[PDB]
Amino acid sequence: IGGTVAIIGFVTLSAGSLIAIQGFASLGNIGVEAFTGFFAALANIRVVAPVVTGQALAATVGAGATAELGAMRISEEVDALEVMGIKSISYLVSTRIMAGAIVIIPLYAMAILLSFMSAQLVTTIFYSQSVGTYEHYFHTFLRVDDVMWSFLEVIIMSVIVMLNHCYFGYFASGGAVGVGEAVGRSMRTSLIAIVLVVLLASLALYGTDPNFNLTV
Amino acid sequence: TESGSMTLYVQMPETLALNANSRVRVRDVFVGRVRKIELINWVPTLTVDVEPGIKLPKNTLAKIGQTSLLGSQHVELNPPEDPSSELLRDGDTIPLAQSSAYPTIERTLAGISGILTGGGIPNIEVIQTEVFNILNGRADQIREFL
């Protein structure tokens, strides 16, 4: 169906649609509905897109890695590697970490692109808002510095998630039954770690300077 | 809410839908909180907690006002122009004579709208038009007629 790319795309499109939908509804109820493009961007970059992309990446890539490493552990393939004079951790876990570091930036770029596209499409097609007003309030109140810091957060989070899932899959036990339990535990830990990382990074970055100006 | 805070009772004529946990302000400084807004014998009574270290004359004026147009409300406890030597102690009451409320934006606009709709405003322009017809190019002639 596309693999990690398709799942990431669907989940980020859903998150952007939710932002646009609820945002436009609430602002139209209040009356100040031209700020939707301003509201959506700060919703995606600050809170929604990093966390949502992290959970989808956790699920797909981390659960796949945990299952693969557990299957290798049960099938005595790690023992086969150790017998043939190979550092099992270097061959498996370090390779997974390098692959994740290489792959995370394109994945999060696609996630950000699709979240922005979904929010804009929902606001300016289904809700029939003019594209000019949306683009103005989007490009005026969005700072590329926020996007760069968000990319750094996502890279750190992906490294942590890959480490956690490789740990849970590498030391699996109990045959084929234990692999599923390892996957579940790894998923719980990954959710907690992703949310904590995003919270700490946002607290550190904008604790003093909110990096947003509207009034005088 | 800290130890040493004093408790006062303010008999407001009305509260203007003021909620509990609103801010008590002295010199526009948030220095207290309103605890309860129970209505006793059809006259609203407010229980107000004020932080320690504030001196208020016994004839202090209490006034319910608006903090911002799209925002909250508050209770101002401001000394009058002739403060008394006696001070408000714990449990003392600010009577109905010293309690008042600022006009709301709705009440002000309602008064203005009453003037506009019940005051014959559409006549004014007509009057002005006719005045413009009297004085149009005739000011010197009117002066010499005087």
Partner: protein
């Protein structure tokens, strides 16, 4: 900064400005009894880069941003600025506070 009243919609985190540009933020507000009269005392945290730029006789006003927005502390240069520069030990006062909607 001492003043007769703090002003409504003036809370910690309010911008302190010089010539209209932010140079700091408001830290805290307190009520101080001066000659048996309560007054407002504001503590400002200012980046020391601009301290050498602010004259000693700088006018201080607790002005309003918008009709709906909050208030900010505004510093301006007087007609005859002093050679001395603003610092932590200089007593300063607010010339005026914008009138409330009440």
């Amino acid at each position: 900064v001492l003043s007769g009243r703090a002003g409504l919609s003036m809370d910690p985190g309010s911008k302190v400005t010089f010539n209209g540009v932010p140079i700091g933020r408001l830290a805290s507000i307190d009520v101080v009894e001066v000659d048996d009269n309560p007054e407002a005392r504001l503590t400002l945290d200012v980046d020391p880069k601009y301290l050498d730029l602010i004259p000693e006789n700088a006018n201080v006003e607790l002005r309003a941003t918008t009709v709906f927005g909050n208030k900010y502390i505004s510093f301006l240069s007087p007609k005859n600025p002093s050679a001395e520069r603003l610092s932590a030990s200089t007593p300063i006062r607010a010339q005026g506070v914008t009138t409330e909607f009440n």
